[PDB]
Amino acid sequence: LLEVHNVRIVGMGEELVVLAHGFGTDQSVWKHVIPHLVDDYRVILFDNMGAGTTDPEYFSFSRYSTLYGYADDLLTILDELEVQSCIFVGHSVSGMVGCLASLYRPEIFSKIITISASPRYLNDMDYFGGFEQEDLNQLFEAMQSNFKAWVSGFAPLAVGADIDSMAVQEFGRTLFNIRPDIAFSVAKTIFQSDLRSILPKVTVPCHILQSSKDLAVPVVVADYLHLTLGGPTIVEVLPTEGHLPQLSSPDIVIPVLKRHVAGNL
Incomplete structure:
Protein backbone atom coordinates (compact mmCIF):
# COMPACT_ATOMS: atom_id res chain seq x y z
CA LEU A 1 0.00 0.00 0.00
CA LEU A 2 1.09 3.56 0.92
CA GLU A 3 0.49 4.39 -2.73
CA VAL A 4 -3.07 3.21 -2.08
CA HIS A 5 -3.71 5.37 0.99
CA ASN A 6 -1.85 8.37 -0.52
CA VAL A 7 0.60 8.39 2.39
CA ARG A 8 2.68 11.57 2.66
CA ILE A 9 5.17 12.27 5.43
CA VAL A 10 5.97 16.00 5.12
CA GLY A 11 7.75 17.75 8.00
CA LEU A 16 6.26 12.11 14.77
CA VAL A 17 2.59 13.03 14.36
CA VAL A 18 -0.11 11.19 12.38
CA LEU A 19 -3.08 13.14 10.98
CA ALA A 20 -6.16 11.05 10.16
CA HIS A 21 -9.29 12.52 8.61
CA GLY A 22 -12.92 11.72 9.32
CA PHE A 23 -15.89 10.83 7.15
CA GLY A 24 -16.63 12.72 3.95
CA THR A 25 -13.23 14.43 3.77
CA ASP A 26 -9.64 13.37 3.14
CA GLN A 27 -6.19 14.57 4.22
CA SER A 28 -7.05 17.92 2.60
CA VAL A 29 -8.92 18.60 5.86
CA TRP A 30 -5.47 19.26 7.37
CA LYS A 31 -4.58 21.89 4.73
CA HIS A 32 -4.40 24.81 7.16
CA VAL A 33 -2.92 22.66 9.95
CA ILE A 34 0.22 21.36 8.23
CA PRO A 35 2.25 24.62 7.95
CA HIS A 36 1.85 25.18 11.70
CA LEU A 37 3.31 21.69 12.35
CA VAL A 38 6.18 21.21 9.88
CA ASP A 39 8.74 23.12 11.95
CA ASP A 40 8.11 21.22 15.21
CA TYR A 41 6.90 17.75 14.15
CA ARG A 42 7.24 15.32 11.26
CA VAL A 43 3.71 14.76 10.01
CA ILE A 44 2.35 11.53 8.52
CA LEU A 45 -0.76 12.02 6.37
CA PHE A 46 -3.00 9.50 4.63
CA ASP A 47 -6.53 8.91 3.38
CA ASN A 48 -8.98 6.35 4.73
CA MET A 49 -10.07 3.51 2.49
CA GLY A 50 -13.28 4.57 0.77
CA ALA A 51 -12.54 8.29 0.50
CA GLY A 52 -12.96 9.95 -2.88
CA THR A 53 -9.15 10.09 -3.02
CA THR A 54 -9.19 6.32 -3.22
CA ASP A 55 -9.71 3.49 -5.71
CA PRO A 56 -13.09 1.91 -4.78
CA GLU A 57 -11.84 -1.57 -5.74
CA TYR A 58 -9.72 -1.86 -2.57
CA PHE A 59 -12.77 -0.95 -0.47
CA SER A 60 -13.82 -4.27 1.03
CA PHE A 61 -17.37 -3.73 2.29
CA SER A 62 -16.72 -6.71 4.57
CA ARG A 63 -13.48 -5.34 6.03
CA TYR A 64 -14.88 -1.88 6.82
CA SER A 65 -18.20 -3.07 8.25
CA THR A 66 -16.53 -2.26 11.59
CA LEU A 67 -14.20 0.51 12.69
CA TYR A 68 -11.58 -2.12 13.55
CA GLY A 69 -11.00 -2.49 9.81
CA TYR A 70 -9.71 1.08 9.68
CA ALA A 71 -7.64 0.59 12.84
CA ASP A 72 -5.76 -2.24 11.12
CA ASP A 73 -5.06 -0.13 8.03
CA LEU A 74 -3.61 2.46 10.42
CA LEU A 75 -1.36 -0.11 12.09
CA THR A 76 -0.39 -1.49 8.68
CA ILE A 77 0.49 1.98 7.37
CA LEU A 78 2.52 2.68 10.51
CA ASP A 79 4.54 -0.54 10.12
CA GLU A 80 5.29 0.00 6.45
CA LEU A 81 6.78 3.28 7.72
CA GLU A 82 8.83 1.49 10.45
CA VAL A 83 7.16 3.72 13.05
CA GLN A 84 7.83 2.72 16.66
CA SER A 85 6.13 5.66 18.41
CA CYS A 86 4.11 8.71 17.39
CA ILE A 87 1.36 11.12 18.41
CA PHE A 88 -2.02 10.35 16.86
CA VAL A 89 -4.37 13.20 15.93
CA GLY A 90 -7.73 11.86 14.80
CA HIS A 91 -10.63 13.87 13.38
CA SER A 92 -14.20 12.65 14.00
CA VAL A 93 -14.40 8.86 13.45
CA SER A 94 -10.61 8.56 13.14
CA GLY A 95 -10.36 9.65 16.77
CA MET A 96 -12.08 6.42 17.77
CA VAL A 97 -10.13 4.49 15.12
CA GLY A 98 -6.93 5.47 16.92
CA CYS A 99 -8.29 4.26 20.26
CA LEU A 100 -9.06 0.96 18.54
CA ALA A 101 -5.55 0.68 17.12
CA SER A 102 -4.14 1.30 20.60
CA LEU A 103 -5.91 -1.81 21.89
CA TYR A 104 -3.89 -3.81 19.36
CA ARG A 105 -0.62 -1.89 19.94
CA PRO A 106 -0.69 0.15 23.17
CA GLU A 107 2.96 1.21 22.69
CA ILE A 108 2.65 2.77 19.21
CA PHE A 109 0.88 5.87 20.57
CA SER A 110 2.39 8.06 23.29
CA LYS A 111 -0.65 10.33 22.89
CA ILE A 112 -4.04 10.46 21.15
CA ILE A 113 -5.71 13.76 20.25
CA THR A 114 -9.34 13.40 19.16
CA ILE A 115 -11.17 16.23 17.40
CA SER A 116 -14.98 15.86 17.52
CA ALA A 117 -14.77 12.13 18.26
CA SER A 118 -17.67 10.03 19.51
CA PRO A 119 -17.90 6.35 20.54
CA ARG A 120 -21.66 6.18 19.91
CA TYR A 121 -24.08 8.55 18.20
CA LEU A 122 -27.33 6.79 19.10
CA ASN A 123 -28.89 7.86 22.39
CA ASP A 124 -28.93 5.32 25.21
CA MET A 125 -29.70 5.10 28.91
CA ASP A 126 -27.57 7.76 30.62
CA TYR A 127 -25.78 8.51 27.33
CA PHE A 128 -26.53 11.57 25.19
CA GLY A 129 -25.07 10.73 21.80
CA GLY A 130 -27.41 13.16 20.06
CA PHE A 131 -29.34 10.88 17.69
CA GLU A 132 -32.14 8.31 17.67
CA GLN A 133 -32.88 5.53 15.19
CA GLU A 134 -35.58 7.63 13.53
CA ASP A 135 -33.05 10.42 12.99
CA LEU A 136 -30.69 7.79 11.56
CA ASN A 137 -33.23 6.01 9.33
CA GLN A 138 -34.42 9.34 7.91
CA LEU A 139 -30.83 10.16 6.97
CA PHE A 140 -30.21 6.82 5.23
CA GLU A 141 -33.30 7.36 3.05
CA ALA A 142 -32.21 10.79 1.78
CA MET A 143 -28.68 9.44 1.35
CA GLN A 144 -29.90 6.77 -1.09
CA SER A 145 -32.94 8.56 -2.55
CA ASN A 146 -30.97 11.53 -3.95
CA PHE A 147 -27.32 11.45 -2.88
CA LYS A 148 -26.47 14.66 -4.73
CA ALA A 149 -29.43 16.37 -3.06
CA TRP A 150 -28.49 14.93 0.34
CA VAL A 151 -24.91 16.20 0.09
CA SER A 152 -26.30 19.64 -0.75
CA GLY A 153 -28.04 19.85 2.63
CA PHE A 154 -25.72 17.75 4.78
CA ALA A 155 -22.57 19.75 4.02
CA PRO A 156 -23.70 23.17 5.38
CA LEU A 157 -24.78 21.51 8.62
CA ALA A 158 -21.64 19.40 9.08
CA VAL A 159 -19.19 22.29 8.70
CA GLY A 160 -21.82 24.48 10.28
CA ALA A 161 -21.41 27.94 8.79
CA ASP A 162 -22.71 29.61 5.65
CA ILE A 163 -23.82 27.62 2.58
CA ASP A 164 -21.25 29.81 0.80
CA SER A 165 -18.06 29.45 2.87
CA MET A 166 -15.11 27.73 1.23
CA ALA A 167 -15.09 24.98 3.87
CA VAL A 168 -18.74 24.08 3.20
CA GLN A 169 -18.17 23.92 -0.56
CA GLU A 170 -14.87 22.03 -0.22
CA PHE A 171 -16.33 19.48 2.20
CA GLY A 172 -19.34 19.09 -0.07
CA ARG A 173 -17.11 18.17 -3.01
CA THR A 174 -15.10 15.49 -1.17
CA LEU A 175 -18.33 14.16 0.35
CA PHE A 176 -19.90 13.87 -3.11
CA ASN A 177 -16.68 12.35 -4.51
CA ILE A 178 -17.36 9.10 -2.62
CA ARG A 179 -18.98 6.28 -4.57
CA PRO A 180 -22.59 6.57 -3.34
CA ASP A 181 -23.07 3.00 -2.10
CA ILE A 182 -19.68 3.13 -0.38
CA ALA A 183 -20.76 6.37 1.31
CA PHE A 184 -24.06 4.83 2.40
CA SER A 185 -22.19 1.81 3.77
CA VAL A 186 -19.60 3.82 5.72
CA ALA A 187 -22.29 6.11 7.13
CA LYS A 188 -24.24 3.25 8.72
CA THR A 189 -20.95 1.86 10.05
CA ILE A 190 -20.05 5.09 11.86
CA PHE A 191 -23.47 6.31 12.99
CA GLN A 192 -24.46 2.86 14.33
CA SER A 193 -21.10 2.01 15.92
CA ASP A 194 -20.85 1.50 19.69
CA LEU A 195 -17.38 1.63 21.25
CA ARG A 196 -18.18 2.55 24.87
CA SER A 197 -17.33 -0.86 26.32
CA ILE A 198 -13.71 -0.67 25.06
CA LEU A 199 -12.93 2.81 26.40
CA PRO A 200 -11.89 1.59 29.91
CA LYS A 201 -9.30 -0.59 28.11
CA VAL A 202 -7.67 2.42 26.41
CA THR A 203 -4.62 3.40 28.47
CA VAL A 204 -3.02 5.87 26.02
CA PRO A 205 -3.21 9.52 27.17
CA CYS A 206 -6.15 11.03 25.29
CA HIS A 207 -6.58 14.77 24.74
CA ILE A 208 -10.24 15.38 23.86
CA LEU A 209 -10.86 18.44 21.67
CA GLN A 210 -14.52 19.29 21.09
CA SER A 211 -16.21 22.08 19.17
CA SER A 212 -18.68 24.30 21.02
CA LYS A 213 -21.56 23.57 18.62
CA ASP A 214 -21.28 20.25 16.77
CA LEU A 215 -24.13 18.60 14.87
CA ALA A 216 -22.89 15.02 15.26
CA VAL A 217 -21.16 15.29 18.65
CA PRO A 218 -22.75 16.89 21.73
CA VAL A 219 -20.27 18.51 24.10
CA VAL A 220 -21.28 16.09 26.86
CA VAL A 221 -19.82 13.26 24.76
CA ALA A 222 -16.37 14.75 25.40
CA ASP A 223 -16.89 14.62 29.17
CA TYR A 224 -18.09 11.02 28.79
CA LEU A 225 -14.80 10.09 27.11
CA HIS A 226 -13.04 11.99 29.90
CA LEU A 227 -14.57 9.80 32.62
CA THR A 228 -14.85 6.49 30.75
CA LEU A 229 -11.44 6.29 29.06
CA GLY A 230 -8.94 4.23 31.03
CA GLY A 231 -5.76 6.29 30.74
CA PRO A 232 -5.05 9.95 31.47
CA THR A 233 -7.50 12.33 29.82
CA ILE A 234 -8.12 16.05 29.45
CA VAL A 235 -11.01 17.88 27.78
CA GLU A 236 -10.78 21.17 25.89
CA VAL A 237 -13.87 22.77 24.38
CA LEU A 238 -12.91 24.74 21.29
CA PRO A 239 -14.79 28.08 20.97
CA THR A 240 -15.89 27.10 17.49
CA GLU A 241 -18.93 26.09 15.45
CA GLY A 242 -18.76 23.07 13.17
CA HIS A 243 -17.77 19.41 12.80
CA LEU A 244 -14.53 20.14 10.89
CA PRO A 245 -13.05 23.04 12.89
CA GLN A 246 -9.48 22.55 11.64
CA LEU A 247 -10.92 23.32 8.18
CA SER A 248 -13.50 26.04 8.89
CA SER A 249 -11.77 27.90 11.76
CA PRO A 250 -8.05 27.06 11.63
CA ASP A 251 -6.96 30.37 13.19
CA ILE A 252 -8.78 29.54 16.43
CA VAL A 253 -8.08 25.81 16.51
CA ILE A 254 -4.37 25.50 15.67
CA PRO A 255 -2.96 27.24 18.80
CA VAL A 256 -5.11 24.88 20.89
CA LEU A 257 -4.23 21.76 18.88
CA LYS A 258 -0.50 22.55 18.94
CA ARG A 259 -0.66 22.99 22.72
CA HIS A 260 -2.04 19.48 23.23
CA VAL A 261 0.34 17.91 20.70
CA ALA A 262 2.99 19.15 23.17
CA GLY A 263 1.17 18.22 26.42
CA ASN A 264 2.53 15.63 28.87
CA LEU A 265 -0.67 14.55 30.70
Whole structure:
Protein backbone atom coordinates (compact mmCIF):
# COMPACT_ATOMS: atom_id res chain seq x y z
CA LEU A 1 0.00 0.00 0.00
CA LEU A 2 1.09 3.56 0.92
CA GLU A 3 0.49 4.39 -2.73
CA VAL A 4 -3.07 3.21 -2.08
CA HIS A 5 -3.71 5.37 0.99
CA ASN A 6 -1.85 8.37 -0.52
CA VAL A 7 0.60 8.39 2.39
CA ARG A 8 2.68 11.57 2.66
CA ILE A 9 5.17 12.27 5.43
CA VAL A 10 5.97 16.00 5.12
CA GLY A 11 7.75 17.75 8.00
CA MET A 12 11.09 18.46 9.72
CA GLY A 13 10.36 18.14 13.46
CA GLU A 14 11.78 15.77 16.05
CA GLU A 15 8.50 14.11 17.10
CA LEU A 16 6.26 12.11 14.77
CA VAL A 17 2.59 13.03 14.36
CA VAL A 18 -0.11 11.19 12.38
CA LEU A 19 -3.08 13.14 10.98
CA ALA A 20 -6.16 11.05 10.16
CA HIS A 21 -9.29 12.52 8.61
CA GLY A 22 -12.92 11.72 9.32
CA PHE A 23 -15.89 10.83 7.15
CA GLY A 24 -16.63 12.72 3.95
CA THR A 25 -13.23 14.43 3.77
CA ASP A 26 -9.64 13.37 3.14
CA GLN A 27 -6.19 14.57 4.22
CA SER A 28 -7.05 17.92 2.60
CA VAL A 29 -8.92 18.60 5.86
CA TRP A 30 -5.47 19.26 7.37
CA LYS A 31 -4.58 21.89 4.73
CA HIS A 32 -4.40 24.81 7.16
CA VAL A 33 -2.92 22.66 9.95
CA ILE A 34 0.22 21.36 8.23
CA PRO A 35 2.25 24.62 7.95
CA HIS A 36 1.85 25.18 11.70
CA LEU A 37 3.31 21.69 12.35
CA VAL A 38 6.18 21.21 9.88
CA ASP A 39 8.74 23.12 11.95
CA ASP A 40 8.11 21.22 15.21
CA TYR A 41 6.90 17.75 14.15
CA ARG A 42 7.24 15.32 11.26
CA VAL A 43 3.71 14.76 10.01
CA ILE A 44 2.35 11.53 8.52
CA LEU A 45 -0.76 12.02 6.37
CA PHE A 46 -3.00 9.50 4.63
CA ASP A 47 -6.53 8.91 3.38
CA ASN A 48 -8.98 6.35 4.73
CA MET A 49 -10.07 3.51 2.49
CA GLY A 50 -13.28 4.57 0.77
CA ALA A 51 -12.54 8.29 0.50
CA GLY A 52 -12.96 9.95 -2.88
CA THR A 53 -9.15 10.09 -3.02
CA THR A 54 -9.19 6.32 -3.22
CA ASP A 55 -9.71 3.49 -5.71
CA PRO A 56 -13.09 1.91 -4.78
CA GLU A 57 -11.84 -1.57 -5.74
CA TYR A 58 -9.72 -1.86 -2.57
CA PHE A 59 -12.77 -0.95 -0.47
CA SER A 60 -13.82 -4.27 1.03
CA PHE A 61 -17.37 -3.73 2.29
CA SER A 62 -16.72 -6.71 4.57
CA ARG A 63 -13.48 -5.34 6.03
CA TYR A 64 -14.88 -1.88 6.82
CA SER A 65 -18.20 -3.07 8.25
CA THR A 66 -16.53 -2.26 11.59
CA LEU A 67 -14.20 0.51 12.69
CA TYR A 68 -11.58 -2.12 13.55
CA GLY A 69 -11.00 -2.49 9.81
CA TYR A 70 -9.71 1.08 9.68
CA ALA A 71 -7.64 0.59 12.84
CA ASP A 72 -5.76 -2.24 11.12
CA ASP A 73 -5.06 -0.13 8.03
CA LEU A 74 -3.61 2.46 10.42
CA LEU A 75 -1.36 -0.11 12.09
CA THR A 76 -0.39 -1.49 8.68
CA ILE A 77 0.49 1.98 7.37
CA LEU A 78 2.52 2.68 10.51
CA ASP A 79 4.54 -0.54 10.12
CA GLU A 80 5.29 0.00 6.45
CA LEU A 81 6.78 3.28 7.72
CA GLU A 82 8.83 1.49 10.45
CA VAL A 83 7.16 3.72 13.05
CA GLN A 84 7.83 2.72 16.66
CA SER A 85 6.13 5.66 18.41
CA CYS A 86 4.11 8.71 17.39
CA ILE A 87 1.36 11.12 18.41
CA PHE A 88 -2.02 10.35 16.86
CA VAL A 89 -4.37 13.20 15.93
CA GLY A 90 -7.73 11.86 14.80
CA HIS A 91 -10.63 13.87 13.38
CA SER A 92 -14.20 12.65 14.00
CA VAL A 93 -14.40 8.86 13.45
CA SER A 94 -10.61 8.56 13.14
CA GLY A 95 -10.36 9.65 16.77
CA MET A 96 -12.08 6.42 17.77
CA VAL A 97 -10.13 4.49 15.12
CA GLY A 98 -6.93 5.47 16.92
CA CYS A 99 -8.29 4.26 20.26
CA LEU A 100 -9.06 0.96 18.54
CA ALA A 101 -5.55 0.68 17.12
CA SER A 102 -4.14 1.30 20.60
CA LEU A 103 -5.91 -1.81 21.89
CA TYR A 104 -3.89 -3.81 19.36
CA ARG A 105 -0.62 -1.89 19.94
CA PRO A 106 -0.69 0.15 23.17
CA GLU A 107 2.96 1.21 22.69
CA ILE A 108 2.65 2.77 19.21
CA PHE A 109 0.88 5.87 20.57
CA SER A 110 2.39 8.06 23.29
CA LYS A 111 -0.65 10.33 22.89
CA ILE A 112 -4.04 10.46 21.15
CA ILE A 113 -5.71 13.76 20.25
CA THR A 114 -9.34 13.40 19.16
CA ILE A 115 -11.17 16.23 17.40
CA SER A 116 -14.98 15.86 17.52
CA ALA A 117 -14.77 12.13 18.26
CA SER A 118 -17.67 10.03 19.51
CA PRO A 119 -17.90 6.35 20.54
CA ARG A 120 -21.66 6.18 19.91
CA TYR A 121 -24.08 8.55 18.20
CA LEU A 122 -27.33 6.79 19.10
CA ASN A 123 -28.89 7.86 22.39
CA ASP A 124 -28.93 5.32 25.21
CA MET A 125 -29.70 5.10 28.91
CA ASP A 126 -27.57 7.76 30.62
CA TYR A 127 -25.78 8.51 27.33
CA PHE A 128 -26.53 11.57 25.19
CA GLY A 129 -25.07 10.73 21.80
CA GLY A 130 -27.41 13.16 20.06
CA PHE A 131 -29.34 10.88 17.69
CA GLU A 132 -32.14 8.31 17.67
CA GLN A 133 -32.88 5.53 15.19
CA GLU A 134 -35.58 7.63 13.53
CA ASP A 135 -33.05 10.42 12.99
CA LEU A 136 -30.69 7.79 11.56
CA ASN A 137 -33.23 6.01 9.33
CA GLN A 138 -34.42 9.34 7.91
CA LEU A 139 -30.83 10.16 6.97
CA PHE A 140 -30.21 6.82 5.23
CA GLU A 141 -33.30 7.36 3.05
CA ALA A 142 -32.21 10.79 1.78
CA MET A 143 -28.68 9.44 1.35
CA GLN A 144 -29.90 6.77 -1.09
CA SER A 145 -32.94 8.56 -2.55
CA ASN A 146 -30.97 11.53 -3.95
CA PHE A 147 -27.32 11.45 -2.88
CA LYS A 148 -26.47 14.66 -4.73
CA ALA A 149 -29.43 16.37 -3.06
CA TRP A 150 -28.49 14.93 0.34
CA VAL A 151 -24.91 16.20 0.09
CA SER A 152 -26.30 19.64 -0.75
CA GLY A 153 -28.04 19.85 2.63
CA PHE A 154 -25.72 17.75 4.78
CA ALA A 155 -22.57 19.75 4.02
CA PRO A 156 -23.70 23.17 5.38
CA LEU A 157 -24.78 21.51 8.62
CA ALA A 158 -21.64 19.40 9.08
CA VAL A 159 -19.19 22.29 8.70
CA GLY A 160 -21.82 24.48 10.28
CA ALA A 161 -21.41 27.94 8.79
CA ASP A 162 -22.71 29.61 5.65
CA ILE A 163 -23.82 27.62 2.58
CA ASP A 164 -21.25 29.81 0.80
CA SER A 165 -18.06 29.45 2.87
CA MET A 166 -15.11 27.73 1.23
CA ALA A 167 -15.09 24.98 3.87
CA VAL A 168 -18.74 24.08 3.20
CA GLN A 169 -18.17 23.92 -0.56
CA GLU A 170 -14.87 22.03 -0.22
CA PHE A 171 -16.33 19.48 2.20
CA GLY A 172 -19.34 19.09 -0.07
CA ARG A 173 -17.11 18.17 -3.01
CA THR A 174 -15.10 15.49 -1.17
CA LEU A 175 -18.33 14.16 0.35
CA PHE A 176 -19.90 13.87 -3.11
CA ASN A 177 -16.68 12.35 -4.51
CA ILE A 178 -17.36 9.10 -2.62
CA ARG A 179 -18.98 6.28 -4.57
CA PRO A 180 -22.59 6.57 -3.34
CA ASP A 181 -23.07 3.00 -2.10
CA ILE A 182 -19.68 3.13 -0.38
CA ALA A 183 -20.76 6.37 1.31
CA PHE A 184 -24.06 4.83 2.40
CA SER A 185 -22.19 1.81 3.77
CA VAL A 186 -19.60 3.82 5.72
CA ALA A 187 -22.29 6.11 7.13
CA LYS A 188 -24.24 3.25 8.72
CA THR A 189 -20.95 1.86 10.05
CA ILE A 190 -20.05 5.09 11.86
CA PHE A 191 -23.47 6.31 12.99
CA GLN A 192 -24.46 2.86 14.33
CA SER A 193 -21.10 2.01 15.92
CA ASP A 194 -20.85 1.50 19.69
CA LEU A 195 -17.38 1.63 21.25
CA ARG A 196 -18.18 2.55 24.87
CA SER A 197 -17.33 -0.86 26.32
CA ILE A 198 -13.71 -0.67 25.06
CA LEU A 199 -12.93 2.81 26.40
CA PRO A 200 -11.89 1.59 29.91
CA LYS A 201 -9.30 -0.59 28.11
CA VAL A 202 -7.67 2.42 26.41
CA THR A 203 -4.62 3.40 28.47
CA VAL A 204 -3.02 5.87 26.02
CA PRO A 205 -3.21 9.52 27.17
CA CYS A 206 -6.15 11.03 25.29
CA HIS A 207 -6.58 14.77 24.74
CA ILE A 208 -10.24 15.38 23.86
CA LEU A 209 -10.86 18.44 21.67
CA GLN A 210 -14.52 19.29 21.09
CA SER A 211 -16.21 22.08 19.17
CA SER A 212 -18.68 24.30 21.02
CA LYS A 213 -21.56 23.57 18.62
CA ASP A 214 -21.28 20.25 16.77
CA LEU A 215 -24.13 18.60 14.87
CA ALA A 216 -22.89 15.02 15.26
CA VAL A 217 -21.16 15.29 18.65
CA PRO A 218 -22.75 16.89 21.73
CA VAL A 219 -20.27 18.51 24.10
CA VAL A 220 -21.28 16.09 26.86
CA VAL A 221 -19.82 13.26 24.76
CA ALA A 222 -16.37 14.75 25.40
CA ASP A 223 -16.89 14.62 29.17
CA TYR A 224 -18.09 11.02 28.79
CA LEU A 225 -14.80 10.09 27.11
CA HIS A 226 -13.04 11.99 29.90
CA LEU A 227 -14.57 9.80 32.62
CA THR A 228 -14.85 6.49 30.75
CA LEU A 229 -11.44 6.29 29.06
CA GLY A 230 -8.94 4.23 31.03
CA GLY A 231 -5.76 6.29 30.74
CA PRO A 232 -5.05 9.95 31.47
CA THR A 233 -7.50 12.33 29.82
CA ILE A 234 -8.12 16.05 29.45
CA VAL A 235 -11.01 17.88 27.78
CA GLU A 236 -10.78 21.17 25.89
CA VAL A 237 -13.87 22.77 24.38
CA LEU A 238 -12.91 24.74 21.29
CA PRO A 239 -14.79 28.08 20.97
CA THR A 240 -15.89 27.10 17.49
CA GLU A 241 -18.93 26.09 15.45
CA GLY A 242 -18.76 23.07 13.17
CA HIS A 243 -17.77 19.41 12.80
CA LEU A 244 -14.53 20.14 10.89
CA PRO A 245 -13.05 23.04 12.89
CA GLN A 246 -9.48 22.55 11.64
CA LEU A 247 -10.92 23.32 8.18
CA SER A 248 -13.50 26.04 8.89
CA SER A 249 -11.77 27.90 11.76
CA PRO A 250 -8.05 27.06 11.63
CA ASP A 251 -6.96 30.37 13.19
CA ILE A 252 -8.78 29.54 16.43
CA VAL A 253 -8.08 25.81 16.51
CA ILE A 254 -4.37 25.50 15.67
CA PRO A 255 -2.96 27.24 18.80
CA VAL A 256 -5.11 24.88 20.89
CA LEU A 257 -4.23 21.76 18.88
CA LYS A 258 -0.50 22.55 18.94
CA ARG A 259 -0.66 22.99 22.72
CA HIS A 260 -2.04 19.48 23.23
CA VAL A 261 0.34 17.91 20.70
CA ALA A 262 2.99 19.15 23.17
CA GLY A 263 1.17 18.22 26.42
CA ASN A 264 2.53 15.63 28.87
CA LEU A 265 -0.67 14.55 30.70
